[PDB]
Amino acid sequence: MQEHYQPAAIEPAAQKKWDDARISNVSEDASKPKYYCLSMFPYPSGKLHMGHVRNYTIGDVLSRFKLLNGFNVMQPMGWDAFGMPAENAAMKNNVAPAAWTYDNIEYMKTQLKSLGFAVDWEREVATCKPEYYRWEQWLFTKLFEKGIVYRKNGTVNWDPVDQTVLANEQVIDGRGWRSGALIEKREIPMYYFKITDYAEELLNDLDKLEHWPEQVKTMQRNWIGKSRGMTVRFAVSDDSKQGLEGDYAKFLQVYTTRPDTLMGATYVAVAAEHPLATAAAADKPELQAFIAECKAGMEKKGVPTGRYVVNPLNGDKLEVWIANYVLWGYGDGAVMAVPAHDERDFEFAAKYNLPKKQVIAVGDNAFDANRWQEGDKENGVLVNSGDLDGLDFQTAFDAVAAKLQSQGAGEPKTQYRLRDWGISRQRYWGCPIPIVHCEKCGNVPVPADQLPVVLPENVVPDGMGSPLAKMPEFYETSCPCCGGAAKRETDTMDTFIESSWYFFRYMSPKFSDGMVSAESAKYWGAVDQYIGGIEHAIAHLLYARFFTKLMRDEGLVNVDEPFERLLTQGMVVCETYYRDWINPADVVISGTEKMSKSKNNGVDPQELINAYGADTARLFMMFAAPPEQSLEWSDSGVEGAHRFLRRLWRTVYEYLKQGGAVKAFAGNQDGLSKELKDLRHKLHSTTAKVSDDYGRRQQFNTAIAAVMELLNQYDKTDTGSEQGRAVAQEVLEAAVRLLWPIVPHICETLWSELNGAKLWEAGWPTVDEAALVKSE
Ligand SMILES: CC(C)C[C@H](N)C(=O)OP(=O)(O)OC[C@H]1O[C@@H](n2cnc3c(N)ncnc32)[C@H](O)[C@@H]1O
Numbered sequence: 169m170q171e172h173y174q175p176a177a178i179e180p181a182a183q184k185k186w187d188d189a190r191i192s193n194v195s196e197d198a199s200k201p202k203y204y205c206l207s208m209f210p211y212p213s214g215k216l217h218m219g220h221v222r223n224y225t226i227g228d229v230l231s232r233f234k235l236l237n238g239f240n241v242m243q244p245m246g247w248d249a250f251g252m253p254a255e256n257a258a259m260k261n262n263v264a265p266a267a268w269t270y271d272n273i274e275y276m277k278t279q280l281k282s283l284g285f286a287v288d289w290e291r292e293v294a295t296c297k298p299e300y301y302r303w304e305q306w307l308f309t310k311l312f313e314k315g316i317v318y319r320k321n322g323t324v325n326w327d328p329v330d331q332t333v334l335a336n337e338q339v340i341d342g343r344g345w346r347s348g349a350l351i352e353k354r355e356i357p358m359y360y361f362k363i364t365d366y367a368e369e370l371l372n373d374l375d376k377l378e379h380w381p382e383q384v385k386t387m388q389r390n391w392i393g394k395s396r397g398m399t400v401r402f403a404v405s406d407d408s409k410q411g412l413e414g415d416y417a418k419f420l421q422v423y424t425t426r427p428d429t430l431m432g433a434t435y436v437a438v439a440a441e442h443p444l445a446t447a448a449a450a451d452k453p454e455l456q457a458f459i460a461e462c463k464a465g466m467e468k469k470g471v472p473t474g475r476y477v478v479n480p481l482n483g484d485k486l487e488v489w490i491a492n493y494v495l496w497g498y499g500d501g502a503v504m505a506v507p508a509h510d511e512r513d514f515e516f517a518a519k520y521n522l523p524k525k526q527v528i529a530v531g532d533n534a535f536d537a538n539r540w541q542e543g544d545k546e547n548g549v550l551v552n553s554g555d556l557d558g559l560d561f562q563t564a565f566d567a568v569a570a571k572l573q574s575q576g577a578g579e580p581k582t583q584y585r586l587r588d589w590g591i592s593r594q595r596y597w598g599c600p601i602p603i604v605h606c607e608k609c610g611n612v613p614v615p616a617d618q619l620p621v622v623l624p625e626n627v628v629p630d631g632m633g634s635p636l637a638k639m640p641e642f643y644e645t646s647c648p649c650c651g652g653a654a655k656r657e658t659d660t661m662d663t664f665i666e667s668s669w670y671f672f673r674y675m676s677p678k679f680s681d682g683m684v685s686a687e688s689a690k691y692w693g694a695v696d697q698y699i700g701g702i703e704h705a706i707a708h709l710l711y712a713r714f715f716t717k718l719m720r721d722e723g724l725v726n727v728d729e730p731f732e733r734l735l736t737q738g739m740v741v742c743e744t745y746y747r748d749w750i751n752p753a754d755v756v757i758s759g760t761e762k763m764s765k766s767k768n769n770g771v772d773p774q775e776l777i778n779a780y781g782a783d784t785a786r787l788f789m790m791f792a793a794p795p796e797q798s799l800e801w802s803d804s805g806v807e808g809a810h811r812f813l814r815r816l817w818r819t820v821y822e823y824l825k826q827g828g829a830v831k832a833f834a835g836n837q838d839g840l841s842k843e844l845k846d847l848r849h850k851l852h853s854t855t856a857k858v859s860d861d862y863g864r865r866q867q868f869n870t871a872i873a874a875v876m877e878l879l880n881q882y883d884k885t886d887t888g889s890e891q892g893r894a895v896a897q898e899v900l901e902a903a904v905r906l907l908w909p910i911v912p913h914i915c916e917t918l919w920s921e922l923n924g925a926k927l928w929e930a931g932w933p934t935v936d937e938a939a940l941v942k943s944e
């Protein structure tokens with residue numbers, strides 16, 4: 169054993185030892201329990217930096233821990249290669265997106281290999297390769313013929329800087345997710361996934377996820393935004409039906425989220441384009457001028473119609489008003505009004521002298537009918553509501569439902585803030601949409617045998633429009649239904665399509681007959697442990713659950729949920745500079761910020777490895793903070809981690825130098841001195857603590873600190889006697905195994921100096937319970 173700790177000697181040798189043994193190349197082996205640990209794969213939008221390294225080191229620690237515990241561990245890595253991240257970085261450097269992506273991938277592979285992650289590289293995927301994206305094209309066509317994917321014109325989010333439409337989940341505070349530019353509204357046909365068909369299942373199945381952070385589930389619940397409401401039909405008065413036809417001559421229908429206030433409705437509003445408004449305006453120029461002023465176009469305005477509808481629950485004849493705040497096409501185009509319990513209706517009734525019937529009371533408060541007081545749903549009881557008096561909200565809801573159901577005048581209706589997922593992008597670098605437009609047959613999907621629709625890679629966009637719409641050699645084709653002249657779709661799929669199913673592709677990444685093979689899907693099931701940032705809560709983490717249910721319903725998988733456990737690691741943060749983002753190693757001082765290529769404050773892992781070794785980089789990331797807490801970059805933290813590794817190396821070197829290796833102490837410890845019994849007590853207490861920290865608490869910094877304390881007590885114990893050396897051997901053999909998930913290169917090397925067996929076959933250290941009993 170050499171005296172000096174030299175990471176450049178031992179880390180390549182350890183990595184070759186692990187690669188040769190193929191311990192990370194796993195098959196569907198039915199003898200060991202499976203463990204699927206996955207970190208969110210990166211965009212090839214530049215060099216990885218230490219923030220990514222923290223993400224992936226956390227995954228490796230958990231993978232290596234489960235490996236030593238006898239699991240068949242799949243930890244796969246790959247490249248989220250399509251979409252704006254890679255393309256925007258390529259265009260900034262005048263490089264074609266394809267060439268830029270593949271070169272970035274190869275540098276990112278060398279970075280990760282230098283860090284010694286226990287990755288099954290034989291499962292590597294690159295999402296921009298046709299062997300990958302053909303299968304999402306296949307799924308697209310299958311869902312298109314079912315109507316789960318559809319094309320429709322509509323109002324969309326337009327990003328004027330990235331020059332593409334964006335999904336709702338990609339609009340962050342009204343700004344594009346990559347550009348930061350203020351979003352605009354346009355009318356543009358897009359392709360949609362009917363994710364609202366799965367809104368209820370997406371919402372309810374969150375309750376299954378006992379091992380997700382509550383915050384992620386809460387954000388998804390609010391994004392889905394379910395509201396249980398009530399459809400209510402008001403019978404049109406017999407004297408108020410002139411000019412109307414069909415249902416509009418019979419009833420006026422509205423949707424409301426407060427049917428407990430239905431007994432308090434004092435008037436009703438309709439949109440200017442509602443058939444009741446147009447029928448009432450036919451005989452009166454009073455309303456036509458208001459409908460014209462409304463159809464032209466915020467402050468609330470309204471006019472009475474003289475038409476009346478009948479409240480189904482008490483028979484009150486409410487007057488119909490035309491109001492500029494009632495949007496047509498939004499629902500029924502009509503609403504009821506409860507001013508005493510809705511602030512908007514209170515203002516409308518105050519501005520136009522409309523009654524205010526109180527129907528809810530909160531505790532012991534009075535009702536001043538001319539001053540709005542702060543609409544409580546949770547704390548409230550009904551008054552002036554017939555047999556509804558005394559009922560709280562949820563009981564009044566179901567009671568009103570039963571009442572309306574008995575007369576055919578209404579029924580419960582659930583709505584969601586979630587809208588359908590718009591996936592069309594006016595971008596070159598993305599999965600081609602497998603549609604051909606035929607003048608005779610319409611928008612037709614490409615046959616399965618003709619898939620993939622191959623994206624040409626010989627393209628350098630100029631930044632002025634969709635490049636594919638500019639290439640007749642791409643879009644001119646034949647219709648697959650009739651053989652006439654036709655045009656391929658030239659929009660591509662948003663990059664989140666690829667990340668919504670890549671975790672299944674890892675299970676069988678060379679499978680040529682489908683997205684994922686039935687045998688491998690049945691073996692691996694779902695991801696046991698997922699690690700990635702909280703920024704994915706409303707988009708990827710929601711999209712992925714949706715795709716999983718889609719693929720399940722197509723018969724491709726048999727799980728309901730893609731990810732069992734989710735760890736959202738904290739951000740690595742670092743100082744930033746701008747002028748034009750500079751890097752600290754090389755103006756303005758924009759202050760401490762998340763490490764990101766977008767701010768050019770990333771620390772390259774390869775440079776730290778070249779100066780200090782991969783084990784140092786890994787150790788600092790796991791020791792500096794609990795994994796969910798943000799971690800501030802620090803040179804002294806790097807140096808402190810390196811000194812500990814020198815201490816570990818020096819500790820074993822000095823032990824071996826004074827006698828060499830002996831057999832570790834084991835068995836009954838009666839006869840050991842008290843100092844050595846205390847050391848064994850600390851040793852096995854530390855094994856229990858580390859085991860619990862890796863497994864149950866997932867707190868790796870305190871695991872490292874526990875091992876440091878064991879070494880502290882070791883240093884203060886005289887271990888030079890024969891029994892001392894056996895206990896020293898035991899301490900050091902446990903210590904390097906406990907730390908191997910964190911710093912495997914130095915622990916593998918030290919293990920081989922201590923013991924001739926293979927570390928991963930000696931397994932995880934066991935707790936000797938007899939060592940934990942205190943002496944009398
Ligand atoms: C599943 C896909 C939609 C993922 C997508 N391709 C993506 O986000 O790719 P990206 O390459 O941006 O990030 C890859 C992973 O690294 C984490 N990460 C990045 N910066 C930092 C940081 N400063 N501190 C800690 N962690 C960080 C980030 O949260 C993510 O889990």
Ligand SMILES: [Mg+2]
Nearest residue numbers: 375376377378
């Ligand atoms: Mg369960």
Ligand SMILES: [Zn+2]
Nearest residue numbers: 606609647650
């Ligand atoms: Zn045709």
